[PDB]
Design a protein around this nucleic acid. Structure first.
Ligand SMILES: Nc1ncnc2c1ncn2[C@@H]1O[C@H](COP(=O)(O)OP(=O)(O)OP(=O)(O)O)[C@@H](O)[C@H]1O
Ligand SMILES: [Mg+2]
Ligand SMILES: [Mg+2]
Ligand SMILES: [Mg+2]
Ligand SMILES: [Mg+2]
Ligand SMILES: [Mg+2]
Ligand SMILES: [Mg+2]
Lengths: 177, 314, 136, 85, 50
RNA sequence: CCGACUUACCAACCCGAUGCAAACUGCGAAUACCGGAGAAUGUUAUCACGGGAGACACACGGCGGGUGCUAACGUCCGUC
RNA sequence: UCCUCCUAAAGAGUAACGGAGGAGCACGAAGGUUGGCUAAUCCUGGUCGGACAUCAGGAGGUUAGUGCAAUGGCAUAAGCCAGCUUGACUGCGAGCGUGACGGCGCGAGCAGGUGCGAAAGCAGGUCAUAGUGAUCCGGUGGUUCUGAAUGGAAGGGCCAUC
RNA sequence: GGGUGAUUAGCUCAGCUGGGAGAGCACCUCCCUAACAAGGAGGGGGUCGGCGGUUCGAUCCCGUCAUCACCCACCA
């Protein structure tokens, strides 16, 4: 891809010497991106979930799978099976295309952006991020949207540590703090 | 059966319903008295008695209450409306060689109910098409204020899935219904339209014509627009639901445009008359039907005979 | 007065109290009151012997109650015929078989725990003996 | 002396008829095809060779021979087979 | 007790019917199954009747 | 707001010890029951069919229990 | 009246005005098959979003689930999803179990037709055990079986059903 | 000793096999009045007896206990 070979040269050469790995199979690689958006308010009407799915499919070149509530919670006034969020899994070429077109022309568009948290690693090397505003992607033209529905990114990688995930993700110029 | 006219039949009907209500009240009285008797002890080794028990058990029966619609037709309040609501300038529309609207201009002040009247196919529904934006006028210049939110009710009910139940068709399956600002329970909202029991389970196709009109209004008033475009809203409705709708229309903060052929229903609510005439002229008159007739009498023409009553046979 | 909170079943079969006990050793403190005899120990008698022991050693020392009632004893109303269901629970007993260590003390001298147990055993309906800890 | 007698009531007192479950033909017994072996509720015993399972999970002989009981399998379940003897 | 009793009448032209129950509220559409008809000895369509 | 500090603590969660259960079981008898073989013994004691019945108020004692007050020459079952 | 557990004494059964609960239905899919799948709960990071919504990975290992009581069972799932469907077939039925009988239940296999599967195969309702009412009398449809001199018919019978 | 009913705002009471939960007068403010009453305008209130339970909802449905109100305690 545009960034696939970039990774396969620079990041592999860096992480082969950084951690004294004996094999190229040992250096961690990113395996998928999960774009989540739990609408929550679609209990009021399905139109909100359809709109959010439209925005998610615009943002990432894939139709979003509609996720329904797994269990009924009386606190949130939902019951089992209510369509409540949208989710996209990106792998391979689309994964890398979205990764580049994010870390290039979507993070810079974050209002009052000064860096993404570097300590926000789950402990298994995977990273997560919230945007609070979908308009930060160029695909939203402001002339067909209705709300500022936020979005969530989860970069799932094969790293086995937070240091490994940070090392892998910094080589791509991740705007950390 | 009944021999007589509508008003005499109405009187007979009120007397019948009053007698039935009185008999039901007496039944409640007697049932309470006999229940008080049943809830006493035997007092010794004496009877109590199974014949009276049997009489009370057979007295505990069921009576059919009238499923009368009456005043519950719920028109939700829309967003606050500014003074500029709707304005048309020199509106003109034609089809082929017959023209329906020609150089029509009028402005709708807020809070107004506009009785749109005229002959068949004069353009009454096409005007609603232009206002709702589904048709494009030849002479243009239809405009709405930026606060205006439009809710439209069609002349035809051919948009509801006859398979779905009443509750599913009205609410879409979501337990909570969003109406503008406030979230409303879907079952409560549906019951606001006389479907107050297990009538939520009936199918749209299995519904009757009047129930179809009621469900149509329920499904199409949920958008919460402060401008209403009702096209023949009292088609299959009876006098009770008609009165309920008239009251709901009166207690409306927004404004509405109602196309109808019921002169009495239009007269009881209309504040501006939009009446179609020949050669595609749509006379607009600000006022109700009383003052419209008075204006016609003030500047009238000398005749009274419309029809000819041609024939069928030969 | 010891009693279970939130028992599974309200009433219980009368049952039989055979066999020897299981908790037949001093396992927390240094001296214990072993139950030589057999019977049922109600919750009122559990408390009365407990109050006797605390007063005998005053504040000092720790006391363990190794027996808990957990057994509902139903009693029919007075002057009532037979049948018409089972009686209602009126008190809770603990079934006691020979060898059961009921109470045990610690932190007090043996000469004092000897007297403290003698005062409590005067409140219980079964024969007891003063028993000490062992090295197994 | 309107005090001597007293009474009450009860809320339970009903049960169901017994279903006569349990093993019908025991181990080593010779049976004909179609003979019921165990009348179960679940699958306490599972069907082995030459025996079948009904909708009630009744285990019946599908051939004629001796009943056998086994505890074979990775889940240590009791199986009932039949040897054509 | 809202499952009324219906009979599926054979479309083979003989008078033969299976009999069953149906929720007449939630299932207003008439039942229609391909069942065996012992009169003609062929699997044919049975349609709901009274 | 972030709760910033007190339990001579009510307190299930995990661990170490210690109990209890008809409607608990990661265990588990003796007996009883079912089937096969082998003798010895037993006026076939077994089964089927047919003619005739009576009986269907039981009692106490031992053992296992429900109920009752771990009462009753109480009451209700099982077995002798 | 029926179902589940205990009493009930390790085969079956076993009483009391003994101790606890449930049923008088539901489902043309929630039935049949063929593919596929595996929970509860907790921890960590994540926009409104928290005690708990959707997301990601870790523990855990069925504490979940089963249309409804309880018991037994269920990973090859009997649990969850999807495509195609009507075996929720018709005539029978070796052999059993359980009843004092009336009756009730399980059932391989045979014949005719059928669905799913590439096939082996599975399917005669549902994880099982409740969800019910003899006979008489009468109703509906079919069947020349009968048809009070004869040919019809009425009325009967037989089959299905109310 | 046994049985039945009721529990909803400060008081008296209505309340749908679900839907902020309502009415009189009481309370709050403002008008009117020299000043109060009466009258007129606006407004707020709730343990739906309590832990419990099949439920898309438990006020009305769901065993129970708490209390107050009854009823029966006959032949004996
Ligand atoms: N696409 C079209 N082409 C030609 N004529 C049309 C078209 N659409 C509508 N018309 C005709 O134009 C006229 C407009 O009638 P429209 O449906 O607007 O309502 P109306 O006649 O005013 O009222 P009502 O519905 O109450 O009879 C009718 O005569 C209709 O048949
Ligand atoms: Mg019928
Ligand atoms: Mg006896
Ligand atoms: Mg499968
Ligand atoms: Mg076949
Ligand atoms: Mg095929
Ligand atoms: Mg005939």
């Amino acid at each position: 891809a545009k960034l696939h070979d970039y990774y396969k040269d620079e990041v592999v050469k860096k992480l082969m010497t950084e951690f004294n790995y004996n094999s190229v199979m040992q250096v961690p690689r990113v395996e998928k991106i999960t774009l989540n958006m739990g609408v929550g308010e679609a209990i009021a009407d399905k139109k909100l979930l359809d709109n959010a799915a439209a925005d998610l499919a615009a943002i990432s070149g894939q139709k979003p799978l509609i996720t329904k509530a797994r269990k009924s919670v009386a606190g949130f006034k939902i019951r089992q099976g209510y369509p409540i969020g949208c989710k996209v899994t990106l792998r391979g070429e689309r994964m890398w295309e979205f990764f580049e077109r994010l870390i290039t022309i979507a993070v810079p568009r974050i209002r009052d952006f000064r860096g993404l948290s570097a300590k926000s690693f789950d402990g298994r090397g995977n990273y997560s991020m919230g945007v609070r505003e979908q308009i930060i992607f160029p695909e939203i033209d402001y002339d067909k949207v209705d709300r500022v529905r936020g979005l969530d990114i989860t970069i799932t990688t094969t790293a086995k540590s937070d240091e490994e995930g940070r090392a892998l993700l910094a080589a791509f110029d991740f705007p950390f703090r | 059966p009944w021999e007589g006219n509508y008003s005499s039949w109405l009187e007979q009907k009120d007397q019948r319903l009053a007698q039935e209500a009185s008999q039901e009240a007496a039944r409640r009285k007697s049932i309470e008295k006999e229940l008080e008797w049943v809830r006493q002890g035997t007092k010794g080794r004496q009877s109590k008695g199974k014949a009276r028990l049997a009489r009370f058990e057979e007295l505990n029966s069921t009576e059919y209450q009238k499923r009368n619609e009456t005043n519950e037709l719920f028109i939700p309040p829309g967003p606050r409306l500014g003074d500029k609501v709707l304005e048309v300038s020199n509106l003109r529309k034609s089809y082929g060689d017959r023209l329906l609207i020609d150089s029509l201009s009028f402005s709708i002040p807020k809070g107004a109910i506009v009785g749109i009247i005229g002959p068949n196919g004069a353009g009454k529904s096409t005007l609603f098409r232009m206002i709702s934006g589904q048709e494009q006028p030849d002479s243009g210049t239809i405009t709405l204020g930026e606060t205006v939110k439009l809710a439209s009710v069609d002349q035809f009910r051919d948009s509801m899935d006859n398979s779905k139940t009443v509750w599913e068709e009205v609410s879409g399956g979501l337990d909570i219904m969003k109406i503008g600002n406030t979230e409303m329970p879907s079952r409560a909202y549906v019951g606001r339209f006389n479907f107050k029991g297990v009538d939520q389970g009936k199918r749209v196709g299995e519904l009757s014509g009047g129930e179809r009109g009621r469900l149509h209004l329920a499904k199409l008033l949920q958008v919460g627009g402060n401008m209403l475009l009702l096209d023949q809203p009292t088609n299959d409705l009876d006098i009770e639901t008609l009165r309920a709708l008239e009251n709901a229309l009166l207690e409306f903060p927004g404004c509405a445009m109602v196309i109808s052929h019921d002169r009495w229903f239009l007269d009881r609510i209309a504040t501006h008359i939009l009446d179609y005439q020949d050669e595609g002229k749509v006379e607009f008159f600000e006022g109700n039907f009383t003052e419209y007739e008075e204006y016609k009498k003030r500047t009238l023409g000398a005749d009274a005979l419309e029809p000819k009553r041609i024939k069928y046979k030969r | 007065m010891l009693q279970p909170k939130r028992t599974k079943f309200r009433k219980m079969h009368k049952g039989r109290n055979r066999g020897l006990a299981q908790g037949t050793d001093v396992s927390f403190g240094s001296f214990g009151l072993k139950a030589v005899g057999r019977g049922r120990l109600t919750a009122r008698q559990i408390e009365a012997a407990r109050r006797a022991m605390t007063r005998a050693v005053k504040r000092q020392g720790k006391i363990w109650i190794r027996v808990f009632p957990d057994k509902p004893i139903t009693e029919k109303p007075l002057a009532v015929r037979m049948g018409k269901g089972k009686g209602n629970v009126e008190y809770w007993v603990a079934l006691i078989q020979p060898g059961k260590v009921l109470y045990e003390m610690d932190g007090v001298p043996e000469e004092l725990a000897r007297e403290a147990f003698k005062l409590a055993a005067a409140k219980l309906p079964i024969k007891t003996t003063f028993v000490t800890k062992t090295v197994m | 002396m309107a005090h001597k007698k007293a009474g009450g009531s009860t809320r339970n007192g009903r049960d169901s008829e017994a279903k006569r479950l349990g093993v019908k033909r025991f181990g080593g017994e010779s049976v004909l095809a179609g003979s019921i072996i165990v009348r179960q509720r679940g699958t306490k015993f599972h069907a082995g060779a030459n025996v079948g399972c009904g909708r009630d999970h009744t285990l019946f002989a599908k051939a004629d021979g001796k009943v056998k009981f086994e505890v074979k399998g990775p889940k240590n379940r009791k199986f009932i087979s039949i040897e054509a003897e | 007790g809202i499952r009324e009793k219906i009979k599926l009448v054979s479309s083979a032209g003989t008078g033969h019917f299976y009999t069953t129950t149906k929720n007449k509220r939630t299932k207003p559409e008439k039942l229609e199954l391909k069942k065996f008809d012992p009169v003609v000895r062929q699997h044919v369509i049975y349609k709901e009747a009274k």
